[PDB]
Design a protein around this ligand. Structure first.
Ligand code: ANP
Ligand code: ANP
Ligand code: ANP
Ligand code: MG
Ligand code: MG
Ligand code: MG
Lengths: 308, 308, 308
DNA sequence: GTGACCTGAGTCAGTGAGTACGCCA
DNA sequence: GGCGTACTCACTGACTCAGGTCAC
C-alpha cells in the first residue's frame, strides 16, 4: 500500500492530493497506471500538476525493465489453495492465481455461487492450511449470498467460527453501475486485505438486465471494459485474486457461449468452464490459462461443506 | 549500432549531445531518423542547431539509393527466429524476419503469448536451430507473463534454466503513455547490447480500457500511431524482430476482427490469425504478410513449447 | 530533360549554379518551374540574378500554351506500365500510367505493396510487353521492401536473375523531411540515367505518424502539399510513373475513407480503392480518375505475383 | 548672410482525424 | 434469425513607402 497520502511526503501539494483522493484514484500506483489524459480531466489538476505527479510517480516505483527473477520471487506471495472437494488444486493446479482474473464462466445449477463461498472461505484459510490469506470484497449483483453456506463450508475446512470468516463486504449492485464507489474506497490500502479475494458474483449479469439490445451494446461493453480495467488495476495493486463468475447464453444459431464477449475473453487471465453432466456430481474444465493445459475435473457438493 | 555520443566525438557540442540523449535520441540513427520538427521541439535547440545536427547525422549513416541487389545481399542474413514447430516455421518460410514488425491476433485461448513465449527462447539459440544469438526484452501489459511457464520452458531447447531468464528483459507498461516511454528506455538500455527479439505482447489491450468512447478515439489512435512508428524505428536501428500481439471484438452486423482499427492494420508487416481448432490442436493463418503466401498451420501447444 | 549546369557553361556564372545546386535544383526544368519567391530566399542569388536565370530557363524550357492536338501527340506515345494482372490491365486502361501521380489506397492485406513489387519488375520489361524498360526507384517508408518477391516476378516474363535487382534503386525514407530530401537526391539520379518508376511505398504513413494533433494539421497538410508538388515536378519533368500509396481512416459519425484530407484527395490524379474480396481473391474499384470509369474489377495474389 | 517645419496610413485565411461493441432459447 | 447506438479534438505571421514651402 503506497497511497496518495504517502505521496504528500514526496513534496506534492496537499490540496491536489485530496482533490485526487476525492476522485476514483487512491494510490501512487493508480495514477501511475493512468495517462496524462485521465489526469487532465480531474478538476483542480491543470496540465502541470498532472505532469509533475506523473514524474513523481514514475520515479517513486521501479516501473522499468527488470529481468523477471524478482517476478518469480514475487510468485512466492501467491498461493493456490483452492482445495474444494476432490481434484481441485491437483489437476486444476491454479485455483486462485493471485494477480490474475479467474473467471468461472459457468452454467446455472453447476455451483458457481457455492464454489464462490468455498473460495471466499479458502482465501481466509490460515497459515497452517498451506498459507494464510486475507479478504477484502464480495459483490452480490444477482442477490445470492447465503453466509449459511459460508458456515457449512467453514466446518468442511476445519473452521469452527464462520463469523471471523464473514466476508468483509456484502455489497450489491442493483444496476449496471457495477458498484462504482467500492472499487474506490476499498482500494485495500489498510494493513489487512493483503493477498485477498475480490469476488464479483455474476459480474456481467446486470449488464444483461439493465443494458438491453444492440442500442446499448457499445455503452454496456465500454462500461464493462472500464470496470474490468479497474479490476485488473486492483489486482496489479499489491496482489489480489480477482475471482469473478458469469453465466452462459444459448447459441440459437446452431453448448455455452461467452456473455460479455471478447472484452471478458481477453481481459480475464484464467477463464474457466462448468458443466453438470450426469448424477449429482459435476464436471469443470481448466480452459484458458497461459500456464495450465486444458483438462477436466470431478467434484460434488455436500450439505456440511461444499467443493465446486 | 553506433552510439549517439560518437557524434560528439566528431565535434558536436557535448551539451547538445547529452541534451539530445535525454531528449529521446540514444543512437546516431535516432537523431538522423527523426525530422527537424521534433529536434526543434527539444529545449535548448534552435533552428540552426537542429539543421547542423541533421547535416552531421546524414553525413555518417547512408541515407542513399542502394540498388536492390545490395539490399538483397543485406537480406542474406535475416536470422528468421524459428517458432519451434516444424510446420509453423514452414508456413513462415524460415520463420519471422528480423527488421520488420509482426502481429499475432485471435480469440481467447489461441496461444499468442504461447508463440511469444516459445519464440523468444528460440532467439537465444545458435542459428543451428534458427536462433538469433541475442536476447529478449519481452514487454507485457496484462501480466499474462505467468512465471511458472517462464521457468518451466527450458527442458526441450537444449539450454540450462539459468540462461533463459537471465536473457530476457521484462517490465509491465501499464499505461498507454508507458508504452512509448518503455520503448525509449529499451532503446537507451539495449543500444549497448545485441538483442534479437523485442516482444510487445499486447499493444492494443491498453488502447481500449484507457481511451474509452468515441471523441476520445482520435487521441487513442494518434497515440497508437506514435507508438507504432517508434516501434518500427527500432527495426531499422537495431535489426531485430519486434513481434506484437492483438485482440478481437465482435463486429456486430445486426465475429472476429482485430482491434486497433486501421492504424495497427497498416504498420504491421506480417499478420497471423490464431484460432481454436478441432481439439487441442491450433490453427494459424497468414492474414497480411508481404512475402508469405496465405496458408494454414496446425501447430499444437505442447508443454515444452509450440510443437506440431 | 537537361541537367542544371547545361546553359551555365555559356550563360550564368558557374559559382551561383553550384550555389543553387544545394537547393535541390539539379535540372534546368526544375529551375524553370521555380518561383521567384522561392529563389529570393536562397543565399547568393539577387533580384537581377534570379530574373536572368529564370529568363534563361524559360528560354530553354517551353512554358506557354500548346494546342491540345499536339499535346495529344505527346499523350498518344506515353507508356502505361503493366500491372501484373490481366484483369487489372483493362480496368486501369493499360495499367499504371506514366508521367502522372497514381495512388492506390486500401485497408491492409489488399496487395498495395504486392502490386508495387510486381510493378518494380514490370518496370524493366521490353517496350512490346512491359512498362518503360527502365530502372525502377523504390523510395520506401515502411520497410516492406521484399527483394525476394521481386525475384518471383522475374521468373515470370522470362527476366529472371539478379539483373533486375541491379536495375532497381532502393531508397528508405525515415521521416517526412528526409522523404522530401530524398527527392533532391533522387532528382540528380534521373537526369543521368533512365528511371521509369517512382514508387513511394507510402506517401502518407510518416505524415500520419509525425504530425500528431490538430495544431499540426495546418502544418502537415502544407508539407504534404509541398511533397506532392515535388512529386508532380518529378512526374512531369522526368516522365516517371509516380505510384504513391495511401492508407485508410474510419468514419465514426455514422465506411473507410483515405487519410490526407482534401489535399491528397485533390492532388492524386488516379485513385484506386483496393478491397479484399473472397478467399485469396481481392477486388479493385476505381475512386477518382479524370479519364476512366468508376467500375470495379477482380484480381488475386499468388506465389508468382498479383495476377489472376 | 539669416532662417526649420511638419506624420499619414491596415492587411489577409487555413487545415481533417479517428472505430467499438454480443444476444438469446 | 431478428436485434443500433455512441463525438470530441487548435494551432498557425509575416508585410513599407510617401516632400516641398520663402522673404527679409
Ligand atoms: N448445499 C448444497 N448441497 C448440495 N447441492 C447444492 C447445495 N447448494 C446448491 N447445490 C446445487 O448446486 C446448484 C447451484 O448452482 P449455482 O450455479 O451456484 O446457482 P445459480 O442460481 O445459477 N447462481 P449464479 O450462477 O451465481 O447466478 C443448485 O442448483 C443445486 O443443484
Ligand atoms: N503445459 C501445457 N500443455 C499443453 N497446453 C498448454 C500448456 N500450457 C498452456 N497450454 C495451452 O495453451 C493455451 C493458450 O493459452 P491462452 O489462453 O491463449 O493464453 P493468452 O494467449 O495469454 N490468452 P488470450 O489473450 O485470450 O489469447 C491454453 O489454453 C492451453 O490450452
Ligand atoms: N507469395 C504469396 N502468394 C500469395 N499471396 C501472397 C504472397 N505474399 C503475399 N501475399 C498476399 O499479399 C497480402 C499482402 O498484401 P500487402 O501489399 O502486403 O498489403 P499492405 O496493405 O500493403 N500491408 P501493411 O503493411 O499492413 O499495410 C497477403 O496478406 C497475402 O494475401
Ligand atoms: Mg446455478
Ligand atoms: Mg492466447
Ligand atoms: Mg504495403
Amino acid at each position: 500500500p503506497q497511497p496518495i497520502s504517502r505521496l504528500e511526503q514526496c513534496g506534492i501539494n496537499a490540496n491536489d492530493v485530496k482533490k485526487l483522493e476525492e476522485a476514483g484514484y487512491h494510490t501512487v500506483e493508480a495514477v501511475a497506471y493512468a495517462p496524462k489524459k485521465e489526469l487532465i480531466n480531474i478538476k483542480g489538476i491543470s496540465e502541470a500538476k498532472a505532469d509533475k505527479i506523473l514524474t513523481e510517480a514514475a520515479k517513486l516505483v521501479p516501473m522499468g525493465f527488470t529481468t523477471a527473477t524478482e517476478f518469480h520471487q514475487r510468485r512466492s506471495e501467491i498461493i493456490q489453495i483452492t482445495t474444494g472437494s476432490k481434484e481441485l488444486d491437483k489437476l486444476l493446479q491454479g485455483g486462485i492465481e493471485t494477480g490474475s482474473i479467474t473467471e468461472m464462466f459457468g452454467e446455472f445449477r453447476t455451483g458457481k455461487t457455492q464454489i464462490c463461498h468455498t473460495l471466499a472461505v479458502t482465501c481466509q484459510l490460515p497459515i497452517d492450511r498451506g498459507g494464510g490469506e486475507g479478504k477484502a470484497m464480495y459483490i452480490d449483483t444477482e442477490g445470492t449470498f447465503r453466509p449459511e453456506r459460508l458456515l457449512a463450508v467453514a466446518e468442511r475446512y476445519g473452521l469452527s467460527g464462520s463469523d471471523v470468516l464473514d466476508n468483509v463486504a456484502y455489497a450489491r449492485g442493483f444496476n449496471t453501475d457495477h458498484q462504482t464507489q467500492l472499487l474506490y474506497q476499498a482500494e485495500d490500502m489498510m494493513v489487512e486485505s493483503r493477498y485477498a479475494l475480490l469476488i464479483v458474483d455474476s459480474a456481467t449479469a446486470l449488464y444483461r438486465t439493465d443494458y438491453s439490445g444492440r442500442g446499448e451494446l457499445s455503452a454496456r461493453q465500454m462500461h464493462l471494459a472500464r470496470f474490468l480495467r479497474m479490476l485488473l488495476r486492483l489486482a496489479d495493486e499489491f496482489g489480489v485474486a480477482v475471482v469473478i463468475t458469469n453465466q452462459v447464453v444459448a447459441q440459437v444459431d446452431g453448448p455455452k457461449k461467452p456473455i460479455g464477449g471478447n472484452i471478458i475473453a481477453h481481459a480475464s487471465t484464467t477463464r474457466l468452464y462448468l458443466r453438470k453432466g450426469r448424477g449429482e456430481t459435476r464436471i469443470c474444465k481448466i480452459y484458458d490459462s497461459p500456464c495450465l493445459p486444458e483438462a477436466e475435473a470431478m467434484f460434488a457438493i455436500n450439505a456440511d461443506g461444499v467443493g465446486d
